[PDB]
Amino acid sequence: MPIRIAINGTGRIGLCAIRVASQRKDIEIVAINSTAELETLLHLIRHDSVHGHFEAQLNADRTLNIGHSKNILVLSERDINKLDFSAANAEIIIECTGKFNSLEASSAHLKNSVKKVIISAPAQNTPTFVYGVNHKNYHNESVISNASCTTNASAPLLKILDEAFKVENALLTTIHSYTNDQNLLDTKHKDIRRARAAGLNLIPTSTGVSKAISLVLPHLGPKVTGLAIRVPTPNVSLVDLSLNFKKSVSKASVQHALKDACKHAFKGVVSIDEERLVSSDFISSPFSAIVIDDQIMTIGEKNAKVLAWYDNEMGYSERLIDMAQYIAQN
Amino acid sequence: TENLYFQGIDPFTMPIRIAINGTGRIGLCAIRVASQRKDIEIVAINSTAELETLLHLIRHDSVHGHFEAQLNADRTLNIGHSKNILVLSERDINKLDFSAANAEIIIECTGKFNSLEASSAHLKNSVKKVIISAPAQNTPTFVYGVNHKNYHNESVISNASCTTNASAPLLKILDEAFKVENALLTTIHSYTNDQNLLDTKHKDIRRARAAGLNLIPTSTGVSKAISLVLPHLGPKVTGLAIRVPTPNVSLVDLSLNFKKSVSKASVQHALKDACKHAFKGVVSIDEERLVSSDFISSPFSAIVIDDQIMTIGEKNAKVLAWYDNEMGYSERLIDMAQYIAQN
Amino acid sequence: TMPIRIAINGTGRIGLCAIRVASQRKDIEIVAINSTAELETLLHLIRHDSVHGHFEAQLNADRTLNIGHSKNILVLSERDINKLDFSAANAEIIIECTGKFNSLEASSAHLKNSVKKVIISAPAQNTPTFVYGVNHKNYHNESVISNASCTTNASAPLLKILDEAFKVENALLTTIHSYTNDQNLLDTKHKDIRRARAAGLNLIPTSTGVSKAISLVLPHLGPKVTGLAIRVPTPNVSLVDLSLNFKKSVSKASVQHALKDACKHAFKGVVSIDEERLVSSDFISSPFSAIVIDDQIMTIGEKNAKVLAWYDNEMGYSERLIDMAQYIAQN
Amino acid sequence: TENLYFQGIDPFTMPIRIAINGTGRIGLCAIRVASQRKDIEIVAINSTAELETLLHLIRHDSVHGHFEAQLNADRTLNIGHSKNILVLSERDINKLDFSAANAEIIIECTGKFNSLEASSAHLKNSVKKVIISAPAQNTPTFVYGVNHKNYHNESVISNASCTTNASAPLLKILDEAFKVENALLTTIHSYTNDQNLLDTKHKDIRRARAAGLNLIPTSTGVSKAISLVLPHLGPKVTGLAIRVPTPNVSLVDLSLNFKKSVSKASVQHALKDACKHAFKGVVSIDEERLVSSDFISSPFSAIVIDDQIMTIGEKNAKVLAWYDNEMGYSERLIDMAQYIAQN
Ligand SMILES: NC(=O)c1ccc[n+]([C@@H]2O[C@H](COP(=O)([O-])OP(=O)(O)OC[C@H]3O[C@@H](n4cnc5c(N)ncnc54)[C@H](OP(=O)(O)O)[C@@H]3O)[C@@H](O)[C@H]2O)c1
Ligand SMILES: NC(=O)c1ccc[n+]([C@@H]2O[C@H](COP(=O)([O-])OP(=O)(O)OC[C@H]3O[C@@H](n4cnc5c(N)ncnc54)[C@H](OP(=O)(O)O)[C@@H]3O)[C@@H](O)[C@H]2O)c1
Ligand SMILES: NC(=O)c1ccc[n+]([C@@H]2O[C@H](COP(=O)([O-])OP(=O)(O)OC[C@H]3O[C@@H](n4cnc5c(N)ncnc54)[C@H](OP(=O)(O)O)[C@@H]3O)[C@@H](O)[C@H]2O)c1
Ligand SMILES: NC(=O)c1ccc[n+]([C@@H]2O[C@H](COP(=O)([O-])OP(=O)(O)OC[C@H]3O[C@@H](n4cnc5c(N)ncnc54)[C@H](OP(=O)(O)O)[C@@H]3O)[C@@H](O)[C@H]2O)c1
Q: Does D75 carry a binding-site annotation?
A: no
According to the 3-state scheme, what is the secondary structure of B129-192?
EEEECCCCECCCECCCCCCHHHCCCCCEEECCCHHHHHHHHHHHHHHHHHCEEEEEEEEEEECC
Q: How far apart are CA C33 and CA C42, in angstroms?
A: 10
The candidate with the shortest Cα–Cα distance to D243, out of D218, D210, D225, D222, is D218
CB half-sphere exposure, A35, CA atoms < 13 A: 12
- How many other CB atoms are found less than 10 A from the CB of residue C256? 19
Confirm if D168 and D143 have CB atoms less than 8 A apart: yes
The DSSP result for C158-187, as a single string, is HHHHHHHHH-EEEEEEEEEEE--TTSBSSS
B181 vs B259: CA distance, rounded Å: 6
What does the alpha-carbon distance between residue B84 and residue B258 come to, in Å, rounded to a whole number?
52
Residue B41 phi, psi (nearest 5): -130, 120
Distance CA C213, CA C209 (A): 6
Cα–Cα dist D298/D166, whole Å: 12
**What phi and psi, each to the nearest 5 degrees, are found at residue C197?**
-90, 155
DSSP-derived secondary structure letter, D72: -
B2: left (phi over 0), alpha (psi -120 to 50) or beta: alpha
Helical (H) or strand (E) element with A144: strand A143-145
Chains that touch D (3 or more CB pairs under 8 A): A, B, C
Q: Are strands A303-310 and D250-258 parallel, antiparallel or unpaired?
A: unpaired
CA distance B108 to B57: 18
Task: For residue C233, give the DSSP letter.
Answer: S
Which positions ≥6 away from B218 have C-beta within 8 Å?
B189, B204, B206, B207, B240, B241, B242, B243
Report the alpha-carbon distance of residue D84 to residue D80 in Å, rounded: 10
Spatial contact of C65 and C57, defined as CB atoms under 8 Å apart = yes
Instruction: Transcribe A70-106 into DSSP letters.
Output: EEEEEE----TTT--SGGGT-SEEEE-SSS--BHHHH
Q: Are strands A27-33 and A3-8 parallel, antiparallel or unpaired?
A: parallel
Q: Is A202 on the interface with B (CB under 8 A)?
A: no
Alpha carbon of C97 to ligand 3 centroid (Å):
6
Contacts of C51 in chain A (CB under 8 A): 280
Judged on CB neighbours under 10 Å (0-12, 13-18, 19+), D203 is exposed
Confirm or reject: Cβ of C317 under 6 Å from ligand 3: yes
Task: Report the alpha-carbon distance of residue C18 to residue C20 in Å, rounded.
Answer: 5
User: Do residues B133 and B113 touch, judged by C-beta distance below 8 A?
Assistant: no
Contacts by A220-224 with C-beta closer than 8 Å and gap 24+?
A220/A158, A220/A162, A220/A167, A220/A170, A222/D312, A222/D313, A223/A167, A223/A168, A223/A169, A223/A170, A223/D312, A223/D313, A224/A158, A224/A167, A224/A169, A224/A170, A224/A171, A224/A172, A224/D312
Residue D222 dihedral angles phi and psi, to the nearest 5°: -75, -55
The SS3 call for residue D325 is coil
- CA-based nearest distance D205→chain A, Å: 7
The count of C-alpha atoms lying within 13 angstroms of the C-alpha of B197, restricted to the half-sphere facing its C-beta, is 24
Catalytically annotated residues of D = 162
Whole-angstrom distance between the N-terminal and C-terminal Cα of chain A? 16
SS3 label, residue C110: helix
Residue C289 CB less than 6 A away from ligand 3: no
Strand segments (E) across chain B: 16-21, 40-46, 60-61, 65-66, 70-71, 77-79, 82-88, 105-108, 129-132, 156-158, 180-190, 216-219, 237-244, 250-258, 283-286, 302-305, 310-312, 316-323
Q: Residue A33 carries which side chain, given as an amino acid letter?
A: N
Eight-class DSSP state of D100: G
Say how many Å lie between the first and final Cα of chain C, rounded.
15
Contact partners for chain B, using 3 or more CB pairs closer than 8 A, are: A, C, D
- 3-class SS of residue A136: helix
Q: Name which of D39, D52, D47, D136 is nearest D98 in CA terms.
A: D47
Note whether D23 and D47 are within 8 A (CB). yes
Best mutation site among A12, A84, A317 for ligand 1 pocket (most ligand atoms within 8 Å of CB): A12
Strand partners, B44: B19, B86
Q: What are the DSSP E strand ranges found in chain C? A: 4-9, 28-34, 48-49, 53-54, 58-59, 65-67, 70-76, 93-96, 117-120, 144-146, 168-178, 204-206, 225-232, 238-246, 271-274, 290-293, 298-300, 304-311
C65, C40, C45: which is closest to C55 by C-alpha? Answer: C45
Q: Could you give the residue numbers annotated as active site of A?
A: 149
CB contact under 8 A, C201 and D25: no
Residue B306: which residues within 8 A CB-CB, separation 6 or more?
Answer: B268, B271, B272, B285, B286, B287
Cα B145 to its chain centre, rounded Å, is 13
Q: Are B45 and B87 in contact (CB under 8 A)?
A: yes
**Alpha-helical runs (H) found in chain D:** 2-6, 25-34, 51-59, 116-119, 162-178, 222-229, 264-276, 327-342
Closest CA to A273 of D205, C62, D241: D205
Orientation of helix A209-216 relative to helix A149-165, angle to 10°:
60
Interchain pair A188, B48: CB under 8 A: yes
How many beta carbons lie within 10 A of that of residue C111, not counting itself? 13
Q: Which residues, 6+ apart, have CB-to-CB distance to D219 below 8 Å?
A: A295, D240, D241
Backbone torsions φ then ψ of B258, nearest 5 degrees: -110, 160
Contact A89, A113 (CB under 8 A): yes
Please report, for residues B185, B229, D196, D261, the alpha-carbon distance to residue B256 in angstroms, rounded to integers and kept in the order given: 9, 18, 39, 73
Pocket residue to mutate for ligand 3, from C80, C97, C107, most atoms within 8 A of Cβ: C97
CB B114 within 8 A of CB B194: no
- D271/D306 Cα distance (integer angstroms): 9
The matching CATH number, chosen from 3.40.50.720, 1.25.40.10, 3.40.50.1370, 2.40.30.130, for A3-126 is 3.40.50.720
Nearest of D58, D106, D50 to residue D78 by alpha carbon = D58
Cα angle value D174/D176/D179 (rounded, 5°)? 75
Which three-class secondary structure state does DSSP give residue A133?
coil
Instruction: Give, rounded to a whole angstrom, the gap between the first and last alpha carbons of chain D.
Output: 22
Q: Give the B window 224-243 contacts with A, CB below 8 Å.
A: none
Domain over D162-325 is classified CATH 3.30.360.10: yes
Classify residue B154 by burial, with Cβ atoms within 10 Å: 0-12, 13-18, 19+. middle
Q: Supply the CATH classification number for the domain C4-127.
A: 3.40.50.720
Taking the C-alpha atoms of residue C27 and residue A126, their distance in angstroms, rounded to an integer, is 60
Do C151 and C177 touch, CB atoms closer than 8 A? yes
Judged on CB neighbours under 10 Å (0-12, 13-18, 19+), B71 is middle
Distances in whole angstroms, Cα of residue A6 to Cα of each of A32, A110, A317, D111: 5, 12, 14, 58
Angle between helices C39-47 and C13-22 (to 10 degrees): 70
Ligand 1 centroid, distance to A97 Cα (angstroms): 4
Judge whether C201 and D36 are in contact, CB under 8 Å. no
Topology, domain A149-312 = Dihydrodipicolinate Reductase; domain 2 (3.30.360)
Amino acid at D244: V
Distance CA B216, CA B189 (A): 10
DSSP string, A29-80: EEEEE-SS-HHHHHHHHHEETTTEE---EE-TTS-EEETTEEEEEEE----T
What's the C180 CA to ligand 3 centre distance in angstroms? 10
How far is residue D144's CA from residue D169's CA, in Å, rounded to a whole number? 9
C-beta separation of D21 from D92 below 8 A: no
Alpha-carbon distance A121 to A124, whole Å?
10
Q: What determination technique applies here? A: X-ray
| Rounded-to-integer distance, Cα A152 and Cα D239, Å | 24
Coil vs helix vs strand at A119: strand
Which H or E run contains B2? Answer: helix B2-6
Which amino acid is it at B309? I
Residues 6+ apart with CB under 8 A from D333: D26, D30, D33, D107, D131, D133, D159
Q: Which residues contact D92 (CB under 8 A, 6 or more apart)?
A: none
- Burial (CB count within 10 angstroms: exposed 0-12, middle 13-18, buried 19+), residue D225: buried
Instruction: For ligand 4, say whether the CB of D248 is within 6 Å of any of its atoms.
Output: no
Query: Please, which contacts does D273-279 make with residues 24 or more away whose CB atoms are closer than 8 Å?
Result: D274/D169, D274/D173, D275/D304, D278/D145, D278/D173, D279/D145, D279/D169, D279/D173
* CB spacing of A299 vs D213 below 8 angstroms: no
Distance CA D110, CA D131 (A): 12
* CA–centroid distance for D91 within its chain: 22
Please state, in angstroms and as integers, the Cα–Cα distance from residue D165 to each residue in D114, D138, D303, D310, D328, following that order. 17, 19, 12, 22, 9
CATH number of B2-139, picked from 3.40.50.720, 3.30.230.10, 3.40.50.980, 3.90.1150.10: 3.40.50.720
Task: Say if CB A137 and CB A129 are below 8 A apart.
Answer: yes
- If one counts every other C-beta atom within 10 angstroms of the C-beta of residue C229, the result is 21
For chain B, the first-to-last Cα distance in angstroms comes to 22
Q: β-strand C65-67 against C58-59: which pairing, if any?
A: antiparallel
Answer whether D101's CB lies under 8 Å from D91's CB: no
What DSSP string runs through D166-207? HHHHHHHHHHHHH-EEEEEEEEEEE--TTSBSSS---SSTTT
Report how far residue D306's alpha carbon sits from residue D324's, in angstroms, rounded to the nearest whole number: 17
| Cβ–Cβ under 8 Å, residues B305 and B271 | no
Chain D residues closer than 8 Å to A238 by CB: 215, 217, 242
Report strand pairing: B316-323 vs C58-59.
Answer: unpaired
Contact (CB, 8 A) for C81 and C41: no
User: CB burial class (10 A; 0-12, 13-18, 19+) of residue B227?
Assistant: middle
D286-305 burial by CB neighbour count: b if 16+ within 10 A, else e? beebbbbbbbbbbbbbbbbb
Crossing angle of helices A12-21/A38-46, nearest 10°? 70
What are the residue ranges spanned by the domains of chain D? Answer: 2-139, 162-325
Half-sphere exposure of D76 (CA within 13 A, CB side): 12
Query: How far apart, in whole angstroms, are the C-alpha atoms of residue A285 and residue A312?
Result: 9
Indicate the SS3 state at residue C278: coil
Smallest-distance ligand from the CA of B134: 2
Q: Could D291 and A203 be called an inter-chain contact, meaning their C-beta atoms sit closer than 8 Å?
A: yes
Resolution of the experimental structure, in angstroms: 2.6
Q: Report how far residue C243's alpha carbon sits from residue B320's, in angstroms, rounded to the nearest whole number.
A: 14
Q: What's the 3-state SS for A151-213? A: HHHHHHHHHHHHHHHCEEEEEEEEEEECCCCCECCCCCCCCCCCCCEHHHCCEEEECCHHHHH
> Given CB atoms, is B53 within the 8 Å cutoff of chain D?
no
What's the rounded Cα separation, in Å, for the pair B258 and B174? Answer: 9
What is C150-313's CATH topology? Dihydrodipicolinate Reductase; domain 2 (3.30.360)
Q: Where are the beta strands (DSSP E) in C111-161?
A: 117-120, 144-146
